[PDB]
């Protein structure tokens, strides 16, 4: 292979590995904030579904 | 965390119906027919307000 092909092939390799590296660090930071604050799709632990509540008038009036 | 409002004793003072349950049961069928309006108004208020203090009148 010529030096240019190897040279520019290396730039292509470096670009991909640097884009993967930046995303790996961002993912760790995003996971740090999602887990600590609970305001994202991840670490979304379930709470009771309010569709289970019955709102029909009850036998007594205070409820 | 905040005191609970209560009506005054004079606010709760009314002329009660002092007849026994057998008297009520004997008159219940006619009583439901003749007094349905204020009765249903009061029941509608209780199930809406969910508050005995908001239905005294």
Curated annotation (Swiss-Prot), chain A:
Signal peptide: none annotated. It is found in: Mitochondrion inner membrane. Belongs to the complex I NDUFB5 subunit family. Complex I is composed of 45 different subunits. Accessory subunit of the mitochondrial membrane respiratory chain NADH dehydrogenase (Complex I), that is believed not to be involved in catalysis. Complex I functions in the transfer of electrons from NADH to the respiratory chain. The immediate electron acceptor for the enzyme is believed to be ubiquinone. This is NADH dehydrogenase [ubiquinone] 1 beta subcomplex subunit 5, mitochondrial. The lineage of its organism: Eukaryota, Metazoa, Chordata, Craniata, Vertebrata. The chain holds residues 127 to 189 of 189 of the full protein.
UniProtKB/Swiss-Prot annotation, chain B:
A motif (Cx9C motif 1) lies at residues 35-45. Disulfide bonds join 45-55. GO terms for cellular component: mitochondrial inner membrane; mitochondrial intermembrane space; mitochondrion; respiratory chain complex I. It is found in: Mitochondrion inner membrane; Mitochondrion intermembrane space; Mitochondrion. Residues 32-57 form the CHCH domain. It comes from the Eukaryota. The keyword Cell membrane does not apply. Keywords: Disulfide bond, Electron transport, Membrane, Mitochondrion, Mitochondrion inner membrane, Repeat, Respiratory chain, Transport. Belongs to the complex I NDUFA8 subunit family. Contains four C-X9-C motifs that are predicted to form a helix-coil-helix structure, permitting the formation of intramolecular disulfide bonds. Complex I is composed of 45 different subunits. This is NADH dehydrogenase [ubiquinone] 1 alpha subcomplex subunit 8. It comes from Bos taurus. The gene is NDUFA8.
């Amino acid at each position: 292979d010529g030096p240019e092909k190897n040279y520019e092939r290396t730039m292509a390799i470096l670009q991909i590995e640097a884009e993967k590296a930046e995303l790996r660090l961002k993912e760790l930071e995003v996971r740090r904030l999602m887990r600590a604050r609970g305001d994202g799709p991840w670490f979304h632990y379930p709470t009771i579904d309010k569709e289970l509540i019955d709102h029909s008038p009850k036998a007594t009036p205070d409820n | 965390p905040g005191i609970v409002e209560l009506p005054s004793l004079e606010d709760l003072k009314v002329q009660e119906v002092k007849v026994s349950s057998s008297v009520l049961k004997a008159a219940a069928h006619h009583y439901g027919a003749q007094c349905d309006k204020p009765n249903k108004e009061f029941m509608l208020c209780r199930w809406e307000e969910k508050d005995p203090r908001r239905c005294l009148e």
